[PDB]
Amino acid sequence: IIGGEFTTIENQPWFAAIYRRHRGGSVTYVCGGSLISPCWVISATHCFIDYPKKEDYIVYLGRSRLNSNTQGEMKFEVENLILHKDYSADTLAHHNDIALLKIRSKEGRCAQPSRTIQTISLPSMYNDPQFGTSCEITGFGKENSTDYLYPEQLKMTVVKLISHRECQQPHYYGSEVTTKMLCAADPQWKTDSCQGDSGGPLVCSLQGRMTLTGIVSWGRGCALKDKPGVYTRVSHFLPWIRSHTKE
Ligand SMILES: CCOc1ccc(OCC)c(NC(=O)c2cc(C)c(OCCN)c(C)c2)c1
């Protein structure tokens, strides 16, 4: 997150922290996620597409710091790693950038909600806030483009939804942005998602409900003028989600 504030998990209880274990015993941070039900975390496919083996991953819930423990945190294995069949990647865009991780602790259980661990509601079919709506992003991503390490402490910021018309101008993203995507940005271009924020929630208040409107997906650089953060438009993937969170 470029700009914004540091935060703690109690303010983003659905936030999931996703890491990968390597040969040798080292763990690196991969991407953020969001708990949508006790056994299910939603994230972005581009996060896993190169290393699709579900045994390499660790998922934390109730976690505020990158490399240290938080009181109340809970650690999960990935029982099932589902990537989108039609996922793809051009120069800038990822298409169908959406993944499902089925989580279970070492004792075979799903998440237990607590003050620091909660689910976030999905949106209803094609029901999005209007443009100019303020929404929040959360992540462990870079605080500056020149950074080579991620912050140790969770951050959040508030961005505004940008119209498809605005986002589809030649000098923005032209036709690279589709209807299955949403743009969001700071009107003064000082706060943004960045590398390492991939997979995390774009949360908007929808009809009085905190709603998972977007998933951090792509963009050109970080807080660049005329270059918004691009997000998977969750409301357009409800059937995909519904079908893979079953049997
Ligand atoms: C495990 C991560 O393997 C990846 C593979 C491919 C990847 O993409 C290439 C287009 C990415 N994405 C990024 O590195 C990335 C970069 C930026 C600048 C970014 O912020 C844009 C919004 N300001 C985001 C969200 C992700 C990650």
Q: Are residues 127 and 228 in the same domain?
A: yes
Distance of CA 221 from the midpoint of ligand 1 (Å)? 9
222 CB less than 6 Å from ligand 1? Answer: yes
Domain count, the chain: 2
Q: How far apart are CA 17 and CA 31, in angstroms?
A: 7
Report the separation in Å between the CA atom of 94 and the middle of ligand 1, taken as the mean of its atom positions.
9
User: CA–CA distance from 189 to each of 77, 121, 244 (Å)?
Assistant: 38, 28, 37
Q: Taking the CA atoms of 52, 58, 59 and 64 in sequence, report the sign of the dihedral they define.
A: negative
- Which residues are identified as catalytic? 46, 97, 198
C-alpha distances out from residue 139 to 16, 53, 191, 206, 247, Å: 9, 23, 13, 21, 31
- Give the C-alpha distances (Å, rounded to integers) separating 91 from 103, 142, 183, 233: 32, 21, 17, 20
143 and 114 in a single domain? The answer is no
Distance CA 175, CA 177 (A): 5
Q: Are residues 80 and 169 in the same domain?
A: no
Q: What are phi and psi of 20, to 5 degrees?
A: -120, 135
Surface-to-core class of residue 87, CB atoms within 10 Å of its CB (0-12 exposed, 13-18 middle, 19+ buried): middle
In angstroms, what CA-CA distances link 191 with 3, 47, 186, 210, 246? 5, 22, 6, 21, 37
Whether 102 and 135 share a structural domain: no
Do residues 159 and 185 share a domain? yes
The verdict on the CB of residue 194 being under 6 Å from ligand 1 is: yes
Pocket perturbation via mutation, ligand 1, pick of 81, 87, 195 by most ligand atoms within 8 A of CB:
195
For 116-181, give the DSSP string: TB---BPPPTT--PPTT-EEEEEES--SSTT-SS--SB-EEEEEEEE-HHHHTSTTTTGGGS-TTE
Nearest CA to ligand 1 atom 16: 195
Check whether residue 86 and residue 179 sit in a common domain.
no
214 and 225 housed in the same domain = yes
Q: What is the DSSP string of 6-45?
A: E--GGGSTTEEEEEEE-TTS-EEEEEEEEEEETTEEEE-G
Same domain? 104 vs 149: no
Ligand 1 pocket mutation pick from 45, 198, 216, 232 by most atoms within 8 angstroms of CB: 198
Q: Which domain holds residue 215?
A: 1-12+120-235
Spatial separation of the C-alpha atoms in residues 217 and 211, rounded to whole Å: 17
With a 6 Å cutoff on the Cβ, whether 193 touches ligand 1 is: yes
Instruction: Give the atom of ligand 1 at the shortest distance from the alpha carbon of 91.
Output: 10
Closest to 44 (Cα-Cα) out of 31, 61, 57? 31
Residue with tokens 């940005």: 185
Is 1 in the same domain as 23? no
Task: Indicate which CATH number applies to the domain containing 147.
Answer: 2.40.10.10
Interatomic CA distance for residues 180 and 45, integer angstroms? 14
Rounded CA gap, 196 and 208, in Å?
29
- Please check whether residues 63 and 102 belong to one and the same domain: yes
Resolution (A): 2.0
Å from CA of 115 to ligand 1 middle: 31
Residues 23 and 140 in one domain: no
- Between the CA of residue 97 and those of 143, 171, 233, what are the distances in Å? 23, 23, 9
227 lies in the same domain as 157: yes
Q: Is the sign of the CA dihedral 194, 95, 159, 189 positive or negative?
A: positive
